[PDB]
Amino acid sequence: MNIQAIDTRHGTANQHSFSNGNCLPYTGVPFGMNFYAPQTTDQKGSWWFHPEDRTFQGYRVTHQPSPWMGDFSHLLMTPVSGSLSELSLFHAQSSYRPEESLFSPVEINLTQLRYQITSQLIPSMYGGILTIDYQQKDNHLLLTLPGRYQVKQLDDHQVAVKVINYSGCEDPDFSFYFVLHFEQPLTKWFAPSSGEDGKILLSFGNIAQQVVHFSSSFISEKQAQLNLAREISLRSTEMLQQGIADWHNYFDRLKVTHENPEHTKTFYHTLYRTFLFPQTFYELDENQQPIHYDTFSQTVRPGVLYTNNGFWDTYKTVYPLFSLIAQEKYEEMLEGFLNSYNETGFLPKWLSPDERGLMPGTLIDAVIADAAVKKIRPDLMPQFLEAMKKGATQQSERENYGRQGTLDYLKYGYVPSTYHESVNHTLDYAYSDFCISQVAKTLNDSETATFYRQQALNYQQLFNPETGFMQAKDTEGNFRPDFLDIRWGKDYAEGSAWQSSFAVYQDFAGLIKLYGSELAFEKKLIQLCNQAPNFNVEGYGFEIHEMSEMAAIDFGQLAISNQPSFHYPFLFSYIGKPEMAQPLLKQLMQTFDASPTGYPGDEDNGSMSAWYIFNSLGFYPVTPGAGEYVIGMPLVQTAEVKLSNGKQLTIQTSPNKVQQQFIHEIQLNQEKHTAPYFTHQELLNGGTLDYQLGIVPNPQTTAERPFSLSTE
Ligand SMILES: CO[C@H]1O[C@H](CO)[C@@H](O)[C@H](O)[C@@H]1C
Ligand SMILES: [Ca+2]
Ligand code: NA
């Protein structure tokens, strides 16, 4: 699909009570430092765009990764004609016709009906071009400068802005610089000024067209001018062509077809949302050297940096996909994450722009371990191992950094029930421990590998054989009483015991053994899938959108709306019955489409999009750090995968219509493939992956299982 046909309102029909992706209509280049979106309202907090709104407040320069994190370093540009007494966004707002507008990754185009203005925004990595066609005779641009600001007019054609605004930041004066060069001159001079919540009306007089070339920096005004100078001569058409080529660089890596072209349209909308985050958070100085802002020291520091990622989300799918098709980005992003550790003392958890904490666990450890076992940035793994061992043995004095209950986990073999969400923290630390063991192993560090492989079995501490769930346990080894399987919160993050008891990616064979047999585990998985989607709210005291998104559909406790359930269909692969889940995977993929209601829950910065992309191809990374993809059920008929190593994997299915719900046979390079997984090395060899599909199952009788520590 051509990037210009992607409609960025995909996944944007949201509110606090219910998510269909909690996406914004992000216009930008891949991993752009800024994104650009129309703002329709200032009365709904983080939900400042809705696709059903007919009001246009301005073009918002945004860094907002999710409505839960909020924005940082934002401002707006609003074309205006005529006089305004009052310059508030509400007083300057115009209606617009969404159905006559363009909402695409490389271009916004819309008409303000109040002003008879039609305008076009094209993005670049650090800036963009805003072209403004005025019908009226007194023409302006309104800059909305939230928080503390500075603005000045440098000459007739140049304006410089600084704004300080954020939702959370270690630097209370966190500054963003924004520079505008106008083709047509300013007709009114104003003196340098500063204040809070700026409303600056720039005047151009009677011109038919203004062309605004803009750039930005987290370094300085002078760096923002250097970023602008590098692209000032571009016409809007040339910047648009370059942005189309940037997106085609990534889209061209996965050329797919389907029986149903609606499925292809869904694929490419999720692929657009897979190359946005993490956002570039470094600039190139006068010597082309990477520099960035370090909010911990409040200084400019050398090196790459990336932002807008919660590894709790993105470790699941994003970095594994990048390990196949965007290794050059993974390489640079790992360098940035290590820089975050260098600057703060702890490997990052939730960057927006700097450490926000929020979710349980230190899942950066899986991003690191997956890279180590795939030979990505082996040069950094000794530095990563030191950072990981520090996070596993030392408690940050600051609540947002590293492990919570670090020392209690080491004393007891679990985080005790007095900690919030102790089941998640326990299971995430045991999985982290596996990840640390894998990095150690790649470095031939036997003592570290042995100790952390043993720590990785700590999931066993919270398994209650009386219930068949993971439950919180106090310091005397007693399970919290009054257990209810469907009760959300308190001991579990955004789920019940059903959404939390299977986070054992390092050792499913060992978890299965705790149930007593492959058959007792099978019965538990069947009950999870086939029951009603009932929930109890008591751990929260009210219903949250994750509950509502599970209860909106009849897929039992398999809450595909949120990350904890993403791997659930693959649990059948660990008992040698993947055929039980092949229909279920195709039916789960039908919960996605390219519409404004197109995701089953929060998309989370590529996480759910890459879930869809992997499942479309028919395999999935259940265990980052194992170097394997567990086989599912493909939705494509064809795929040409351009691998980062320069080879090509060509996928071909037999006719893949709605009645094909099973895999009959797989050939990899014309050889029968019976294992319920692929190694990373097998896929990197490239060649041909042929799926013969079925309308009935074809049970394989093989003892082969995907990776588990306890059986390796
Ligand atoms: C505070 O926001 C987080 O936590 C909330 C639960 O407290 C979620 O409903 C929401 O989706 C997000 C992950
Ligand atoms: Ca989520
Ligand atoms: Na939806």
CB of 647 closer than 8 Å to CB of 257: no
> Is 133 exposed, middle or buried, given 0-12, 13-18 or 19+ CB atoms closer than 10 A?
middle
Q: Which residues contact 237 (CB under 8 A, 6 or more apart)?
A: none
Structure obtained using: X-ray
- Distance between Cα 14 and ligand 1 center (Å): 14
Go through 73-90 and write b for each residue having 16 or more CB atoms within 10 A of its CB, e for each that does not. Answer: bbbbbbbbbeeeeebebe
CB of 586 closer than 8 Å to CB of 566: no
Q: Closest ligand 1 atom, CA of 602?
A: 11
How many helices (H) and strands (E) the chain has is answered by 18, 34
Any bridge partners for residue 210, and if so which? 132
- Helical H runs in 501-606? 508-515, 518-530, 545-551, 582-589
The Cα–Cα gap between 38 and 286 comes to 33
Resolution (Å units): 1.7
Name the residues around ion ligand 3, CB cutoff 5 A: 20, 597
> Is 4 exposed, middle or buried, given 0-12, 13-18 or 19+ CB atoms closer than 10 A?
middle
Nearest-ligand number for the alpha carbon of 593: 3
Q: Look at the block and give the residue holding tokens 């389907």.
A: 258
The Cα–Cα gap between 709 and 626 comes to 9
Instruction: Specify the 3-state DSSP secondary structure of 655.
Output: coil
C-alpha closest to that of 156 among 202, 111, 195 = 202
Which residue's alpha carbon is nearest to atom 2 within ligand 1? 68
Cβ atoms within 10 A of the Cβ of 443, count?
Answer: 15
- Would the CA dihedral through 391, 393, 398, 400 be positive or negative? positive
- Distance between Cα 68 and ligand 1 center (Å): 7
The Cα–Cα gap between 192 and 150 comes to 7
The Cα–Cα gap between 42 and 53 comes to 12
Nearest-ligand number for the alpha carbon of 599: 3
Ligand 1 pocket mutation, candidates 313, 494, 599, criterion most atoms within 8 A of CB = 494
The Cα–Cα gap between 251 and 1 comes to 8
**Polymer length in residues for the chain:** 712
Which residue's alpha carbon is nearest to atom 6 within ligand 1? 494
The Cα–Cα gap between 547 and 317 comes to 23
- Distance between Cα 600 and ligand 3 center (Å): 4
Ligand 1 pocket mutation, candidates 535, 544, 607, criterion most atoms within 8 A of CB = 544
C-alpha closest to that of 24 among 94, 117, 105, 86 = 105
How far lies 191's CA from each of 160, 200, 469, 538, 543, in Å?
12, 12, 67, 57, 52
The Cα–Cα gap between 93 and 43 comes to 13
- Distance between Cα 319 and ligand 3 center (Å): 24
C-alpha closest to that of 591 among 573, 566, 626 = 566
Q: Closest ligand 1 atom, CA of 493?
A: 6
Instruction: Specify the 3-state DSSP secondary structure of 449.
Output: helix
Q: Closest ligand 1 atom, CA of 359?
A: 13
- Distance between Cα 52 and ligand 2 center (Å): 24
- Distance between Cα 2 and ligand 3 center (Å): 24
Structure tokens at 429: 């630390």
- Distance between Cα 612 and ligand 3 center (Å): 14
For the CA atoms of the chain, what is the radius of gyration?
A: 26
Q: Helix 422-442 to helix 381-393 angle, to the nearest 10 degrees?
A: 150
The kind and range of the H/E element at 194 are strand 193-205
C-alpha closest to that of 393 among 444, 443, 345, 348 = 345
The Cα–Cα gap between 119 and 314 comes to 35
CB of 261 closer than 8 Å to CB of 269: no
Nearest-ligand number for the alpha carbon of 19: 3
DSSP 388-399: HHHHHH---SST
Instruction: Specify the 3-state DSSP secondary structure of 710.
Output: helix
The Cα–Cα gap between 479 and 472 comes to 6
Which residue's alpha carbon is nearest to atom 3 within ligand 1? 68
Instruction: Specify the 3-state DSSP secondary structure of 379.
Output: helix
Ligand 1 site, CB within 6 A:
68, 494, 544-546, 602
C-alpha closest to that of 384 among 350, 333, 426 = 333
Cβ atoms within 10 A of the Cβ of 478, count?
Answer: 11
- Would the CA dihedral through 685, 690, 696, 698 be positive or negative? negative
Q: Closest ligand 1 atom, CA of 540?
A: 7
Go through 267-282 and write b for each residue having 16 or more CB atoms within 10 A of its CB, e for each that does not. Answer: bbbbbbbbbbbbbbbb
CA atoms within 13 A on the CB side of 611: 30
